[PDB]
Design a protein around this ligand. Sequence first.
Ligand SMILES: [Mg+2]
Ligand SMILES: [Mg+2]
Ligand SMILES: [Mg+2]
Ligand SMILES: [Mg+2]
Ligand SMILES: [Mg+2]
Ligand SMILES: [Mg+2]
Ligand SMILES: [Mg+2]
Ligand SMILES: [Mg+2]
Ligand SMILES: [Mg+2]
Ligand SMILES: [Mg+2]
Ligand SMILES: [Mg+2]
Ligand SMILES: [Mg+2]
Ligand SMILES: [Mg+2]
Ligand SMILES: [Mg+2]
Ligand SMILES: [Mg+2]
Ligand SMILES: [Mg+2]
Ligand SMILES: [Mg+2]
Ligand SMILES: [Mg+2]
Ligand SMILES: [Mg+2]
Lengths: 91, 125, 56
Amino acid sequence: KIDQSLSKKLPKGTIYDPFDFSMGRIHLDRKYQDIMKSGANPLEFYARPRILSRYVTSTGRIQHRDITGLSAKNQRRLSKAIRRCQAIGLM
Amino acid sequence: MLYELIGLVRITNSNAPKLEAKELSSTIGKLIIQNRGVVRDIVPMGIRYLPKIMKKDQEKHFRAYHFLMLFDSSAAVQSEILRTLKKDPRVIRSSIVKVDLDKQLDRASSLHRSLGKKSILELVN
Amino acid sequence: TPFITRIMAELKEPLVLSKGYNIEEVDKFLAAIESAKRERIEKLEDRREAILRILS
RNA sequence: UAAUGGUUUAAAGGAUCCGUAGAAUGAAUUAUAUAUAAUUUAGAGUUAAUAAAAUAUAAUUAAAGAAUUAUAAUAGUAAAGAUGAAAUAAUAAUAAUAAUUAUAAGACUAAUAUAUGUGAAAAUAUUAAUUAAAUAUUAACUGACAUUGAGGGAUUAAAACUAGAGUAGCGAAACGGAUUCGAUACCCGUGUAGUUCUAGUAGUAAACUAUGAAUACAAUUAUUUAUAAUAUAUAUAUAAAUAAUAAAUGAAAAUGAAAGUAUUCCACCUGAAGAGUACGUUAGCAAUAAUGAAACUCAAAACAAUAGACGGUUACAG
Ligand SMILES: [Mg+2]
Ligand SMILES: [Mg+2]
Ligand SMILES: [Mg+2]
Ligand SMILES: [Mg+2]
Ligand SMILES: [Mg+2]
Ligand SMILES: [Mg+2]
Ligand SMILES: [Mg+2]
Ligand SMILES: [Mg+2]
Ligand SMILES: [Mg+2]
Ligand SMILES: [Mg+2]
Ligand SMILES: [Mg+2]
Ligand SMILES: [Mg+2]
Ligand SMILES: [Mg+2]
Ligand SMILES: [Mg+2]
Ligand SMILES: [Mg+2]
Ligand SMILES: [Mg+2]
Ligand SMILES: [Mg+2]
Ligand SMILES: [Mg+2]
Ligand SMILES: [Mg+2]
């Protein structure tokens, strides 16, 4: 067998080109690799530690907007919700 | 004003953990209704492990019965309720947050509003 | 001054409702809802009292 | 014999805003002699509705969190701590340091984060509540009610002072240990005042964008940011901010929607030094703050840029 990284699995029902059978395709795939990214207000999840534990680190540090990819407003609301959750004995 | 209380009641009686939370809710609700208030919801959260070993007064806890209460009351009685909560050994953590009614008279709790049910009318349909 | 005092007193009267509601209109509206429902008692009193408490 | 000036950096924007006088300035149409009168809504306002987290700001009250220090124990043993390396009158055999618990006290606020924003500025980002303020667009309404603003008023970092609390950490002064030719310094150790809170006084900062406020206008692009649509797509329109610019300006650096084109009102400047000094006055418990000279001396003094030299300056090569 060979390492799965070095191989490319062409999905089912998809068209392909001969290029797809090449290291170029895998390399191009590597280089070019939710609830809050929506109309939902993150400040309504302040009592739901499971949901907003996805937007923190293993130690609990809120993730930068560069990571979360949220809008500025939803980043601010999410940070407020996480801090409030930390204060009220959850989180 | 509509307020949302989220209490973390202690559970010392292992065989019936909900016993404390029921009488907490009864006391707070009696206070609210006898002070020209209204109680809209008493949504129970379950028994959950606290993130840390939280020490209310001089006893350490590792888990608690979480519960939510949505109630309409005035500012003075809301402060009184918070006062009673803070000086109660049964309660480990407490928090009261306003739910703004400038748009809608009817509004669901934070949990139901997060699920998608914006108001109690949706939640009863 | 009479004006300021009368305005504040009228604000402090009982059965004064916020959000532009009037107690007479509210009572008539609730009775109209019930009569319309018939045309298509303590529980209704509790509903009325809850409404007046929320709108107080 | 130069104001046919200036104030980001050469001298010069008031810390900020509010607002009185102004013998300051200021919309539209018509009529009659710059005014009066009647009309108008484009500036400036008021009240609703709608949307949005008006979340952020201010005061108040109520909470949370990591850590630090000390105290007590538990076991365990000879070093620990600090430094460039060491040493310290008060580290450890009186069992220390490290570890694990348990109590106590103060102060602070990790991530998010950009101070994005909010606030007149100073400031302001752990949580919640009360009160107060702040957004856009529509509807209706007032009919110039505006701008600026001498004097005045209010607020105003850090330090400082007066009382009363508090004082864990940090830490002026002081006392010691080093280093040094010397140490009065940088470094190390104890550490008072202060830093914290309450009630005040004081009103200064490179209180800075070193850039006063308002109004009208001027070529682009790209980003966001916030609304309004239209069916993720219109690389969607309308605003603000940010970034790079055209023109213009400018001693240039550069500014760039203002340091451009204009208008209005206020503040300020007039060589260096003497000097923000002296004297006086006012205020303040004081420290001080404000106001603020002159003689004497000189042909200096400063700003931007240019080319070098130098650097206990960077990177790359050989
Ligand atoms: Mg002349
Ligand atoms: Mg200079
Ligand atoms: Mg200057
Ligand atoms: Mg200024
Ligand atoms: Mg100045
Ligand atoms: Mg932070
Ligand atoms: Mg003014
Ligand atoms: Mg500061
Ligand atoms: Mg002080
Ligand atoms: Mg004192
Ligand atoms: Mg101290
Ligand atoms: Mg020290
Ligand atoms: Mg020296
Ligand atoms: Mg020292
Ligand atoms: Mg004062
Ligand atoms: Mg001074
Ligand atoms: Mg000054
Ligand atoms: Mg100039
Ligand atoms: Mg002086």
